[PDB]
């Protein structure tokens, strides 16, 4: 510690103990007056022409720093600027629901929150892996899915034949499809109406109209195709 | 007789639950000798003012620590020349600090 022994530094200078010397330097906010950094004076940030304080402020010089008071009718943006009107008070926002607002000199600025995209006035939810099969991205990394799908990207199909759900019973079979399901008639059944969301549309066909055997009376049945006189068969 | 130009939009690099790293570039038309940079932060949970979190910075990179977990922040940088401070840089994109366990 050479600075402790000799080579004194003035009160406005910081003594830096060195190995091959004992050098003085000024403190932050002070400017050296002599050749060596012996005695230094505070810099006057409020001097004529200096714009350390920016829009709508009044400068106050302190030893080593400075501060800026807002002009009377103005509200503060930061330590160096103020604006005329708080242009985004709460519940009145000119920005989006999922957006931010900070005051600027001469107005305001709107930016969307993390997980959203847009221009502040309108923000849309962003989904990294995206939504699929017609789903919507309602929140950040959250997809809303149509009735027939599920999964974080609406990529999994709901098995409507195994989820209970539709009891495609009676004269039809449940057949799962990507996004929905079918209710297809069993063997020996035809669809009466145009279609139906269940097995109620399927009807028995006249199962020997315009088969059987060369010599066989033909009878109808709910799913049957009967032939008798020789053959005495009982179909389904 | 003019302050320096405004720096470029700062970029967010390292994101923890208590700190954030910033990277900015000086203005292509700086116009006046820059001495240091001033970093300002913004949090909607804190208020509607920009807290000055760093001054006297000499490199174009700085790590703002002492932050709060699970909180949104924004940032901007001012150049500092012989005739005052620059206009603020474009505000950085919003980022949210990580959460604990
Ligand atoms: C902010 O953006 C909105 C909507 O623009 C949309 O989003 C953009 C990111 C881009 O993808 C555009 O192609 C989109 O159309 C602007 O607003 C109008 O919004 C109404 C409904 O809200 C819509 O019917 C109009 O088409 C939109 N007009 C335009 C030109 O897009 C809004 O003007 C933008 N604000 C600013 C300040 O630019
Ligand atoms: C899939 O979506 C359905 C709603 O259609 C929901 O009941 C189910 O819990 C979801 N499953 C998964 C793994 O997302
Ligand atoms: Ca001073
Ligand atoms: Ca299905
Ligand atoms: Ca029949």
Author numbering:
A (entry chain B): 399 to 608, 612 to 630, 636 to 642
B (entry chain A): 553 to 653
Any passages from the paper?
Robo family receptors are type I transmembrane proteins that instruct neuronal wiring in various organisms, including worms, flies, mice, and humans, in addition to fulfilling diverse functions outside the nervous system. While Robo1 and Robo2 function as classical Slit receptors, the divergent family member Robo3 does not bind Slits and instead acts as a negative regulator of Robo1/2-mediated Slit repulsion. Further, a recently identified Robo3 ligand, NELL2, signals axon repulsion. NELL2 is a secreted glycoprotein containing a laminin G-like (LamG) domain, a coiled coil (CC) domain, and six epidermal growth factor-like (EGF) domains, flanked by five von Willebrand factor type C (VWC) domains.
We next set out to determine the structure of NELL2 in complex with Robo3. Using constructs that include the hNELL2 EGF domains 1–6 and the hRobo3 FN domains 1–3, we obtained a stable complex of these molecules, as demonstrated by size-exclusion chromatography (SEC). Surface plasmon resonance (SPR) analysis of this complex yielded a dissociation constant of 0.6 µM. The NELL2–Robo3 complex structure was determined by an MR-SAD phasing strategy to 2.76-Å resolution. The structure shows direct binding between the NELL2 EGF2 and EGF3 domains and the Robo3 FN1 domain, consistent with our domain mapping data. The two EGF domains wrap around the FN domain and interact with the β-sheet composed of the CDFG strands. To our knowledge, this mode of interaction between EGF and FN domains has not been observed before. The human NELL2–Robo3 complex structure displays a surprising partitioning of the overall binding interface into a highly polar interface at the EGF2–FN1 contact, and an entirely hydrophobic interface at the EGF3–FN1 contact. Several mutations nearly abolish binding, while many others yield diminished binding activities, confirming the validity of the crystallographic model. Thus, the affinity of the NELL2–Robo3 interaction determines NELL2 axon guidance activity.
